[PDB]
Amino acid sequence: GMETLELQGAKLRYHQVGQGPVLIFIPGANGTGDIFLPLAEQLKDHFTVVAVDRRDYGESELTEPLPDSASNPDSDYRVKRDAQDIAELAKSLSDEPVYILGSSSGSIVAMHVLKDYPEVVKKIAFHEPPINTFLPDSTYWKDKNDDIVHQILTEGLEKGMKTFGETLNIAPIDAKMMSQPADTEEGRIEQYKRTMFWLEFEIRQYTHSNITLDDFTKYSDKITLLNGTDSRGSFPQDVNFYINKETGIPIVDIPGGHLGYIQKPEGFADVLLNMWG
Amino acid sequence: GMETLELQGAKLRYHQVGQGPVLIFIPGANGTGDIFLPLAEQLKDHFTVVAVDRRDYGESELTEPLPDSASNPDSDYRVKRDAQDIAELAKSLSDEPVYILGSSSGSIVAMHVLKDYPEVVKKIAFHEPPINTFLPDSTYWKDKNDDIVHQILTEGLEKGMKTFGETLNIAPIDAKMMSQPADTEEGRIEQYKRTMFWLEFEIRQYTHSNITLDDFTKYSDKITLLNGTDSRGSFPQDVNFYINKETGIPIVDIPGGHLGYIQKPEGFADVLLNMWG
Ligand SMILES: OB(O)c1csc2ccccc12
Ligand SMILES: OB(O)c1csc2ccccc12
Ligand SMILES: *[B@@](*)([O])C1=[C]SC2=C1[C]=[C][C]=[C]2
Ligand SMILES: *[B@](*)([O])C1=[C]SC2=C1[C]=[C][C]=[C]2
Ligand SMILES: [Ca+2]
Ligand SMILES: [Ca+2]
Ligand SMILES: [Ca+2]
Q1: Ligand 6 centroid distance, CA of B221 (Å)
Q2: Whether domain A3-127 has CATH 3.40.50.10710
Q3: Which ligand lies nearest the alpha carbon of A203?
Q4: Contact call for residues B234 and B205 (beta carbons, < 8 A)
């Protein structure tokens, strides 16, 4: 459907309509070129209009993961790579410098195209740029951006998992260990990533997955249910009590809490050896 | 020093220590086998202990993207693939069925190993399972997992972006359009994933990127600043006013607001044609 330009680390997809000199539209927050298509129809008699899906969005696809440092708020990897994508797109489509319009965060991509690859720019428009770096009050706006990201991404996660743990009657030691911040700032970014992945891709999917009581009954002789000695009253123990009630499969108590295997490894092992050694 | 097993779609990494019959530990929310290493030390004289990084975590790596459907909350792709990984690992390390212990969400993986690959299971233990599907009050626990995810992913973003838009004095028409819930359930999932990505990886990095006014004065003759006529008073217009004040680069007014190119594509095009056609 869309056109493709294969670049280092990505397949860049774009829409193309019209005839005449090339005019590249760079999208803002939505990331995709489809938002420009009604506009392109109005221009297609005068320009070859090109509307880009920036490489992290839409029908574009990465061919290798983002660098770990891209999560750093001062990383320049993505904005420069987006600008290089536009410059390479222009060079692929035109032997002459081209017309470029970016809007909002796409206007910032456009500014980096002019800075890094001026040779591809005939004319350029910055539609409502939100860049703050050169403003006299840059700090105020930078701090507002930093704080809203921190509120939505970090604060929301921290507060939600605390109250969720309490509603499930998770023991304090488990709540602390499952939430404990990594000792390194490289580890804390991974940890956020891992926890958000688990929330979006694991908790709902796994806890409501296709296991029935009859699955337990059929292999009852193979199964041990384990409840921690330090996590009594918590929701997972009620799950085991229900399995036991309906199947007769024994519950064995084992030292520690939800994370008892690392809290009390000697005692945890002693029970496993009684079971299976 | 971790071991590796190449499987469909992933390189599965795992710790291996000890001697004796194979005992595989499946981690829960942390996703990684290292949390079992102190326990492994206590068991290594009786078992070949195998502590897995499940394929989406730790030193494991995917070799092809997750299916687009994995973000759906009723997807079963990941749990079934995790169970298949454990069964394939078991077969690679042992000709006999093996001992398996999973904890928390990893106990759910263990349950699916027993259900779909009982032939690899000698004995199995479910440590503090949080699965709710077969519970008499499953709806209660399921809707609560769904709610905690919705609160952290969706509502925190909704509420934050609303306040953010008031700090930036974004026009109501643009606020509504940039936040409008998509018309399909899957479109809403993609929409919030895209905004979360933009918040972590774009807003801070791009708006405080290294652009100076000197970068514009070098090519002042090629640059047009565009202000929407329906977005007066908003922060991006102030950015354009500062650029124009300091550099003399012209501001051209254009129909619509921050999203004017799709709000009023005919009027937007008319101005571009005046500029450049
Ligand atoms: O704080 B966490 O990241 C976490 C992971 S699993 C679980 C279960 C109950 C409460 C919190 C948690
Ligand atoms: O609501 B959004 O997803 C959004 C994207 S950019 C921006 C700027 C101000 C207020 C909201 C937004
Ligand atoms: B355009 O999407 C826009 C208007 S205000 C603001 C942006 C983009 C990033 C930060 C702030
Ligand atoms: B084990 O990490 C645990 C205790 S309560 C709960 C889980 C996992 C998923 C949902 C709830
Ligand atoms: Ca076309
Ligand atoms: Ca470059
Ligand atoms: Ca330059």
Answers
A1: 24
A2: no
A3: 4
A4: no
